[PDB]
Design a protein around this ligand. Sequence first.
Ligand code: CLA
Ligand code: HEM
Ligand code: BCR
Ligand code: HTG
Ligand code: HTG
Ligand code: HTG
Ligand code: HTG
Ligand code: CA
Ligand code: CL
Lengths: 56, 137, 243, 97, 56
Amino acid sequence: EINRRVQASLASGATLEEAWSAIPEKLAFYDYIGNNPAKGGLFRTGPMNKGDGIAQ
Amino acid sequence: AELTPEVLTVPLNSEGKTITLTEKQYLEGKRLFQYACASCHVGGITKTNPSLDLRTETLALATPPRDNIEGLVDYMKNPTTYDGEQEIAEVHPSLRSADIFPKMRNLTEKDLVAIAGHILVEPKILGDKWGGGKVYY
Amino acid sequence: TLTYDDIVGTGLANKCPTLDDTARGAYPIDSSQTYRIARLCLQPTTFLVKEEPKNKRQEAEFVPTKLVTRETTSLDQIQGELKVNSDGSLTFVEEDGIDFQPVTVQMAGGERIPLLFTVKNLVASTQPNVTSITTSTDFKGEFNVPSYRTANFLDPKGRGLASGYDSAIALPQAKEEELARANVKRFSLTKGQISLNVAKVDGRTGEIAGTFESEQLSDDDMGAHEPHEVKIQGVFYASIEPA
Amino acid sequence: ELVNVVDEKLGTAYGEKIDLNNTNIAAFIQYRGLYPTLAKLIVKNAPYESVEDVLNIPGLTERQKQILRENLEHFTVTEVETALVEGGDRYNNGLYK
Amino acid sequence: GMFVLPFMARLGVTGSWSGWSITGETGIDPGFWSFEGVALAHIVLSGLLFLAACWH
Ligand code: CLA
Ligand code: HEM
Ligand SMILES: CC1=C(/C=C/C(C)=C/C=C/C(C)=C/C=C/C=C(C)/C=C/C=C(C)/C=C/C2=C(C)CCCC2(C)C)C(C)(C)CCC1
Ligand SMILES: CCCCCCCS[C@@H]1O[C@H](CO)[C@@H](O)[C@H](O)[C@H]1O
Ligand SMILES: CCCCCCCS[C@@H]1O[C@H](CO)[C@@H](O)[C@H](O)[C@H]1O
Ligand SMILES: CCCCCCCS[C@@H]1O[C@H](CO)[C@@H](O)[C@H](O)[C@H]1O
Ligand SMILES: CCCCCCCS[C@@H]1O[C@H](CO)[C@@H](O)[C@H](O)[C@H]1O
Ligand SMILES: [Ca+2]
Ligand SMILES: [Cl-]
């Protein structure tokens, strides 16, 4: 989906920086393996923030 | 895929002449190579010196060239170091040293040719597996 | 004339040859003749480690340690050139030999100190005007101390210098900075110093023996921590020969 | 500041050619006629201030000099890296197949 | 925060099997009656008193 949006942006005449800056942080954050539920541990307890941290 | 006459066609000499081995020749080659050579050269490597392998490119950069039938037959008669500088029959199986490497004793010219042919054909079949070692198993 | 079967398992193999108490002679040096040390042997008898005080302004001492890697400590079969210099001094230039041993000694309280006990690339000279090697001759010099582990060595998490991971893979999203010193392996190369005090001389056979003291750094675990200072004391044997 | 010296050296000519001053001897198998005779001489008489200095190894036959000249283009020299030359690693660097 | 260590030292147990002493010496041989030896002794004594308790 991200690539689709970026390509739509470029085709509309945006610059690379512009096209990628138009991508919502929320969307990008979904495209990150630290939010994949199949990356955990049985005794790795608590919130995801306790692992890779609080995303800023 | 098949073991075709084309697969079985290998360089005879450095001058661009080829020779086309029969399937019986190929089988004889595998048998003889296992018989007299595989203990060290299984899969196209060299257990007692892994720096040197039996890949065609390697043989081609050897001195004299060993990427053809004549070169390999000669090597099995009078093996040299990679640069051709030293004769090493005293520590490497050859007809010249069949007295100290007794499995070389019943090997005929025909046999040396079959072994040579095996060494040249096998990488045409196995590609990087040949001389690749465990990475490619 | 002992055989390998006389010696095996006794511990004698880690001992340097001795000279009789009669060996108090002089070995003449022909300044026109070239010479070689055919065999240099160094047998360590004590390993001292300099304690590391807390105020950093105290007089730090070398304390005894307990050897835990058994009779595996001696340097031997060392050979090299013995130059006769212009001023009459002699200079031994080490060429080759079994000239290193990893050694682990233990301090009081249990801290273990590994080191590469060595005289690699030893260059050592006497005083000027040595017309004969005598019980007054001494050699003083320097040697190299390379990393205790060489470049391929992998730590327990598989990190190394010339091979291995370059990061802490078990902590995929940890911050790198705090782990830099453990992640980036470094190869130390420092200098050591040694004195040989000749105590015995067979001027007939060209054999000499005596005591030595060497000083050098210990293992730094490929840059993960600071090395300790080590002082090694023992006996040595050398056979001098016209080359 | 902390640097892996081998990775760093890979960004120099050492990562492009046979470093007469550092590279493990098996590398001389890459090119016709260098291994083992010339390779042993070259490693033995290292280090060299420039590549063509390899020609000054005492005892070299004319053929040997010709082969060396033919292969200078595949050679380089960089500063001796302790980590690559200690432990007799130039003769055996722990790599086989 | 050492509580029994000073009582051992008071009556003459000052060394460890590991080679140190509380007076800061090195390479001392405390014999069996190191701090560890004293501890071991007490543990064993405890065991034996437990068995005797059962019997009585
Ligand atoms: C439906 C059950 C359920 C689920 C899916 C969750 C899910 C969650 N809880 Mg919640 N919670 C629950 C019930 C549940 N909870 C209950 C009942 C309580 C009251 C105790 C709590 C109190 C609670 C607190 C205080 C916290 C959470 C937190 C969390 C989050 C972290 C989970 C974690 O680290 O577990 C780890 C899971 C394990 C380590 C697995 C344990 C496996 C057991 C020990 C095995 C037992 C073996 C057994 C003895 C064998 C017997 C053999 C015999 C038959 C022979 C996660 C979203 C944390 C959080 O992030 O909050 C914001 C947090 O702090 N929960
Ligand atoms: C069996 C008869 C046999 C053959 C055939 C054979 C071939 C062979 C070749 C062609 C080379 C050169 C490789 C190159 O790239 O140039 C070569 C080299 C070595 N071999 Fe061999 N070899 C045969 C038998 C054996 C056996 C049984 C052993 C093990 C004892 C062995 C080992 C070696 C070694 C070592 C080398 C390298 C020699 C050097 O260049 O210094 N071979 N072989
Ligand atoms: C002299 C000395 C000393 C001291 C000592 C002591 C102090 C001792 C003690 C001792 C003791 C203290 C002992 C004890 C013993 C005990 C016992 C011997 C017991 C037994 C028991 C029993 C037998 C029981 C049984 C049972 C059970 C268990 C269960 C139930 C049932 C019945 C009852 C059967 C010292 C060291 C200083 C040193 C010097 C010398
Ligand atoms: C054969 C070289 C001319 C004589 C040199 C000294 C003999 S050396 C000779 O080398 C042969 C391999 O060439 C071996 O078959 C034989 O066992 C070995 O003793
Ligand atoms: C009852 C006996 C229990 C076993 C005693 C443990 C070993 S003794 C132990 O050794 C450590 C390492 O040398 C020291 O650091 C420590 O001071 C010492 O008490
Ligand atoms: C149940 C464990 C028994 C172990 C005994 C070890 C004794 S060790 C022995 O003991 C003497 C008395 O302390 C010392 O004087 C002596 O120096 C020491 O070597
Ligand atoms: C129940 C088995 C426990 C046995 C432990 C015996 C320790 S015995 C103890 O050991 C010290 C060295 O560590 C010596 O300095 C000392 O002389 C000796 O008594
Ligand atoms: Ca003296
Ligand atoms: Cl290769």
